[PDB]
UniProtKB/Swiss-Prot annotation:
EC class: lyase
Known outcome of mutating T196 to D/E: Strongly reduced activity, but enhanced zinc affinity
Effect of H62G: Impaired activity, not rescued by 4-methylimidazole (4-MI)
Its job: Catalyzes the reversible hydration of carbon dioxide. Can also hydrate cyanamide to urea. Stimulates the chloride-bicarbonate exchange activity of SLC26A6. Essential for bone resorption and osteoclast differentiation. Involved in the regulation of fluid secretion into the anterior chamber of the eye. Contributes to intracellular pH regulation in the duodenal upper villous epithelium during proton-coupled peptide absorption.
Cell division in keyword set: no
The keyword Ligase is assigned to this record: no
Outcome (variant: H92 to C/D/E/N/Q): Strongly reduced CO(2) hydrase and p-nitrophenyl acetate esterase activities, impaired stability of zinc binding
A Gene Ontology biological process term: morphogenesis of an epithelium
Name the record gives this protein: Carbonic anhydrase 2
Domain of life: Eukaryota
Length: 258
């Protein structure tokens, strides 16, 4: 499969190889804050990242992933809409060529400069590959980024990007603390959805934080210097690696707050 974010292989084309692209619970979506229903029955979110073990950062030609040791319950997400324990496996971002675009979710149609996805899988399914075949297999925690002041907790990520410029490159990335990427508030919206990249599997409980984090212009500028291409190939800047909002169809977005 040769999917991407260009005119000839971008989101509008994905349905040809991945028909589920036109499915009933596709992501991302627009979050209409005036339609989302406060669900007083949602439990508080439990983000338990103290024992998180980062390993490696990889440019996969679509984004970069920071990978974690998920062979044990080290870094987990519980509570909120979730039943059971979801293990952190990686995080990545989507971002734009310009500060007014880049997020995949939107809020009342507002696009943010970027969006952070912390990907977790349901341990009841034993491994990630099994989990993605289940309607409740994954929980992705989505965090918006807006351009303003620098995010100190992001800088170690920013500084290693020069070493993974092109597709297939990876670098050691141990001892990174993902807690430094969280906003103060854990207020969130939640809805059932999908992976936002092929194979677009409908296996995700989305948890999208209401409070964005601020990153500096210089920080996101360094995201934009990454390459989609591999080494020794013509340069294609890794920018605008976001899927646009998809039809909500028969889904309700629930809010953890009023
Ligand atoms: N925009 S977002 O909604 O959030 C995401 N969009 N894609 C994401 N991942 C990549 C992925 C993998 N698979 C998949 C399909 C069939 C069988 C198995 C996996 N679908 N999407 C999440 C993700 C997966 N992995 C892989 O998981 C495996 C278990 O560790 C192993 O092959 C590697 O470690 C790693 O490549 N990494 N990330 S998330
Ligand atoms: Zn993502």
């Amino acid at each position: 499969h040769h999917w991407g974010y260009g005119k000839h292989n971008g989101p509008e084309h994905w349905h040809k190889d991945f028909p589920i692209a036109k499915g009933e619970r596709q992501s991302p979506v627009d979050i209409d804050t005036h339609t989302a229903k406060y669900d007083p029955s949602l439990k508080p979110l439990s983000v338990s990242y103290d024992q998180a073990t980062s390993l490696r950062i990889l440019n996969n030609g679509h984004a970069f992933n920071v990978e974690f040791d998920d062979s044990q319950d080290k870094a987990v997400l519980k509570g909120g809409p979730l039943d059971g324990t979801y293990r952190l496996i990686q995080f990545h971002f989507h971002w734009g060529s310009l500060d007014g675009q880049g997020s995949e979710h939107t809020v009342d149609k507002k696009k943010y400069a970027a969006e952070l996805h912390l990907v977790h899988w349901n341990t009841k399914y034993g491994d990630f590959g099994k989990a993605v075949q289940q309607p409740d297999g994954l929980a992705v925690l989505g965090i918006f980024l807006k351009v303003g002041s620098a995010k100190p907790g992001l800088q170690k990520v920013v500084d290693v990007l020069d070493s993974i410029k092109t597709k297939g490159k990876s670098a050691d990335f141990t001892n990174f603390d993902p807690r430094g990427l969280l906003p103060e508030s854990l207020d969130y919206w939640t809805y059932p959805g999908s992976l936002t990249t092929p194979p677009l599997l409908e296996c995700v409980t989305w948890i999208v934080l209401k409070e964005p984090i601020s990153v500096s212009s210089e920080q996101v500028l360094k995201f934009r210097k990454l390459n989609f291409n591999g080494e020794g190939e013509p340069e294609e800047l890794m920018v605008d690696n976001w899927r646009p909002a998809q039809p909500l169809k028969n889904r309700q977005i629930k809010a953890s707050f009023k």
